[PDB]
C-alpha cells in the first residue's frame, strides 16, 4: 500500500514530481565478480511525511538533497536513528548507495546493514549534508538531540507548525 517503512519509521509521500525511481548500481572487482545493489531515490521535488513513535514531521527534497526538515518531538529526544531512516529513504548521504564502505560489498542485505552501522557510529555525513549554523535559536543540536543546548546547530531543521 501507500505507506512505506524503513526500520521503525513510516514514510508517506504527500506530493512529488515523479514516482520514486530505481538505480541498478553495480559494484565490480572483475568481469566475473560483481554485485548488483539497487537503491531508490526521487527525481525532482518531493514532500514526504514521516513518523516514528513519538516523533513525526515532514521533509522536502530535490533529487538527492534535503531542502528542509520540520519535526515534532519530545524535549531531549535522541533523533539519530530516525534521521538515518530518512537519509536511507532518499539516499541522501554516502557511503551506502554509490560508494562502498571501504570494502567490496557481499550483497544487498549486507549493504543496508552496513549503512546504519557505519553512520550511527559516525554521523558527520549528515551534518555535512545539512550544514552547521551559528544561530542557536534552531532546535537540533549537532549530536542530533532535540532542543539540546549547544554552541552551534544543524541547518534547515526546524519545528513543525
Residue numbers in the entry: 325 to 485
Which text from the study accompanies this structure?
The three largest gene segments of the Thogotoviruses, THOV, DHOV and JOSV are homologous to those of IAV and code for the heterotrimeric polymerase. In this paper we present the atomic structures of the putative PB2 cap binding and 627 domains of THOV and the putative PA N-terminal endonuclease domains of THOV and DHOV. Despite very low sequence homologies, all domains have similar folds to those of the corresponding IAV polymerase domains. However, the critical active site residues in the putative cap binding and endonuclease domains are not conserved in THOV and DHOV and, contrary to the case of IAV polymerase, neither domain shows the expected in vitro biochemical activity.
A construct comprising residues 323–486 could be expressed, crystallised in two different forms, and its structure determined at 1.8 Å resolution. Firstly, the so called ‘348-loop’ formed by the β3–β4 hairpin is longer in THOV and its extremity orientates away from the body of the domain towards the solvent, whereas in IAV the tip packs against bends the body of the molecule. This is apparently not an artefact of crystal packing as a very similar conformation of this beta hairpin is observed in the second crystal form. Finally, in all three crystallographically independent examples of the THOV domain, the equivalent position of the m7G itself is occupied by the side-chain of Arg344, with its guanidinium group stacking with the side-chain and making two hydrogen bonds to the main-chain carbonyl oxygen of Tyr413. Furthermore, given the high resolution, well-ordered structure of the THOV domain, which is the same for all three crystallographically independent copies observed, it is extremely unlikely that the putative active site region could be repacked through induced fit to allow m7G binding. Thus the significantly different nature and arrangement of the residues within the putative active site of THOV would appear to preclude any possible binding of m7G in a similar manner to that observed in IAV. The THOV domain is not retained by m7G Sepharose under conditions where IAV cap-binding domain is and, similarly, no binding of m7GTP could be detected by isothermal calorimetry experiments under conditions where IAV cap-binding domain shows clear binding with a Kd of 2.7 µM.
